[PDB]
């Protein structure tokens, strides 16, 4: 049988189900960690916010709910100053949550930093970004020149799992698994800057094991490291990425 492996956290046991249904065999190798930052941590941030900002820019969906949790838990009103903000959204994601807390974006991007530069305003003052745990330094950097002080706001973390990330390097270069499968662009750098011999690491996925990706941004990520990815997906289902998958690989 094919061996699949996931570098995806949240959703690993559907993969696995699925996997076996369509007789591939599965293997779980995740490459992150996440875990949701305590309010008390950031309270300092939130309030702040409250205090009101000239911009706001989210990246994520999660990212924007726990947000508006987080100004419950501290009994903080948001929704005034978020409301008078210029609010942007890098992508559908984080889009929809803003629309769905009644503060739907005046501008959204691709789902990447690089979109979002032509809609950043120039202007002044204080730029909320709310983060989840990886650098944004193109972004950070661009809401400085456009003069903004930028705020953080860091609601979850997202991490590599580094141990994960040695774990799946090394069954890879094994000639372990067949293909691999990502969910998240982030995930590709996780394993890419986490990696021992990177430039195997590109060999590998490049002529023996599969890439797949989930999204587009995904598959760029990907191609940035220098891997062509064998497959994209760009339903977001996971059925839908491997019966794909499964359909590309015989047409071979």
Same mark, same amino acid.
């Not at 590109?202 to 599969?210: C, D, G, P």
């Given at each position: 049988a094919v061996r699949v492996a996931y570098a995806g956290l949240r959703r690993k046991e559907a993969f696995k189900a699925l996997a076996e249904k369509l007789g591939f065999t599965p293997l779980l190798f995740p490459v992150q960690a996440t875990e949701k930052v305590p309010v008390p941590e950031y309270r300092d941030q939130v309030r702040a916010l409250a205090q009101g900002v000239d911009l706001f820019l989210a990246t994520t969906g999660v990212g924007v709910r726990d947000l508006m949790e987080a100004g419950k838990a501290l009994g903080l009103d948001l929704e005034g100053p978020l409301a008078k903000a210029f609010r942007l959204a890098r992508g559908a994601k984080a889009a929809r949550a803003l629309k769905e807390a009644g503060l739907p974006p005046h501008a959204v991007g691709? %789902?990447?930093?690089?979109?979002l530069l032509p809609l950043l305003p120039q202007g002044r003052g204080v730029a909320a970004l709310q983060l989840y %745990?990886?650098?944004?330094p193109l972004l950070e950097n661009a809401l400085a020149e456009r003069g903004y002080r930028v705020l953080p706001l860091m609601p979850y973390r997202h991490l590599p799992d580094p141990e994960g990330i040695l774990r799946l390097e090394e069954a890879l270069l094994r000639g372990e698994v067949d293909a691999l499968a990502f969910v998240a662009a982030m995930q590709v750098e996780f394993l890419f800057e986490g990696a021992k011999d990177p430039k195997a690491l590109r060999e590998a996925l490049n002529t023996r094991v599969k890439a797949l990706a989930v999204g587009r941004v995904t598959a760029d990520a990907l191609r940035e490291w220098g891997v062509k990815p064998f497959y994209v997906d760009e339903t977001e289902r996971l059925g839908s990425m491997l019966q794909g998958f499964k359909r590309a690989l015989q047409k071979e």
């Amino acid at each position: 049988a094919v061996r699949v492996a996931y570098a995806g956290l949240r959703r690993k046991e559907a993969f696995k189900a699925l996997a076996e249904k369509l007789g591939f065999t599965p293997l779980l190798f995740p490459v992150q960690a996440t875990e949701k930052v305590p309010v008390p941590e950031y309270r300092d941030q939130v309030r702040a916010l409250a205090q009101g900002v000239d911009l706001f820019l989210a990246t994520t969906g999660v990212g924007v709910r726990d947000l508006m949790e987080a100004g419950k838990a501290l009994g903080l009103d948001l929704e005034g100053p978020l409301a008078k903000a210029f609010r942007l959204a890098r992508g559908a994601k984080a889009a929809r949550a803003l629309k769905e807390a009644g503060l739907p974006p005046h501008a959204v991007g691709d %789902g990447t930093s690089k979109s979002l530069l032509p809609l950043l305003p120039q202007g002044r003052g204080v730029a909320a970004l709310q983060l989840y %745990g990886k650098p944004l330094p193109l972004l950070e950097n661009a809401l400085a020149e456009r003069g903004y002080r930028v705020l953080p706001l860091m609601p979850y973390r997202h991490l590599p799992d580094p141990e994960g990330i040695l774990r799946l390097e090394e069954a890879l270069l094994r000639g372990e698994v067949d293909a691999l499968a990502f969910v998240a662009a982030m995930q590709v750098e996780f394993l890419f800057e986490g990696a021992k011999d990177p430039k195997a690491l590109r060999e590998a996925l490049n002529t023996r094991v599969k890439a797949l990706a989930v999204g587009r941004v995904t598959a760029d990520a990907l191609r940035e490291w220098g891997v062509k990815p064998f497959y994209v997906d760009e339903t977001e289902r996971l059925g839908s990425m491997l019966q794909g998958f499964k359909r590309a690989l015989q047409k071979e």
